[PDB]
Amino acid sequence: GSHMNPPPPETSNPNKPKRQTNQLQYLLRVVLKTLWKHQFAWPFQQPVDAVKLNLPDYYKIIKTPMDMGTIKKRLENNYYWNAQECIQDFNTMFTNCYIYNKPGDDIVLMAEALEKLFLQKINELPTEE
Numbered sequence: 001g002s003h004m005n006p007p008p009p010e011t012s013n014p015n016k017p018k019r020q021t022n023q024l025q026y027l028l029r030v031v032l033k034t035l036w037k038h039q040f041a042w043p044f045q046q047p048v049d050a051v052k053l054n055l056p057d058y059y060k061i062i063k064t065p066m067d068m069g070t071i072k073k074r075l076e077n078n079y080y081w082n083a084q085e086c087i088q089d090f091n092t093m094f095t096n097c098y099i100y101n102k103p104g105d106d107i108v109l110m111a112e113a114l115e116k117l118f119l120q121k122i123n124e125l126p127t128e129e
C-alpha cells in the first residue's frame with residue numbers, strides 16, 4: 001500500500017443516497033459475474049499498483065482510475081443510485097486501458113475481449129422496473 005499510489009476510488013459513503021434497482025442487480029449478477037470470471041479479467045480485478053509494475057507515470061496520465069474490484073465492491077455495498085453510474089465506471093476502466101497502453105498491447109487485447117462481452121450484456125440490460 002505504497003504512498004506513491006493514490007487512494008483507491010470511494011466504495012462507501014453514508015452521505016451518498018443509494019438504491020437497489022433491477023438494473024443494478026443485473027449488473028452485479030450477470031455483467032460483473034461474466035467479466036470477473038473471464039480468463040482475461042486478472043489485470044482489471046484491482047487498482048493498478050504503479051509501484052509494483054514500475055509505471056511511475058501511470059497516475060500522471062490516468063487521473064480517473066477505475067477497476068473491476070472497485071466496481072465489485074460498489075455493487076456489493078449498494079453504492080450506486082442507478083445503472084448509468086456503474087456503466088460509466090466500466091467505461092472509464094476500459095478507456096483508461098486504451099489511453100495508457102498502445103493498440104495491440106496484450107492488456108488492450110484483453111480489455112477489448114472483455115468490452116465485447118460487456119457490450120453484449122449491456123445491450124440486454126433489462127427495462128427498469
Ligand SMILES: O=C1CC(I)=CC=N1
Nearest residue numbers: 037038039040041042
Ligand atoms: O484465468 C487465468 C489464470 C491465470 I494463472 C492466468 C490467466 N487467466
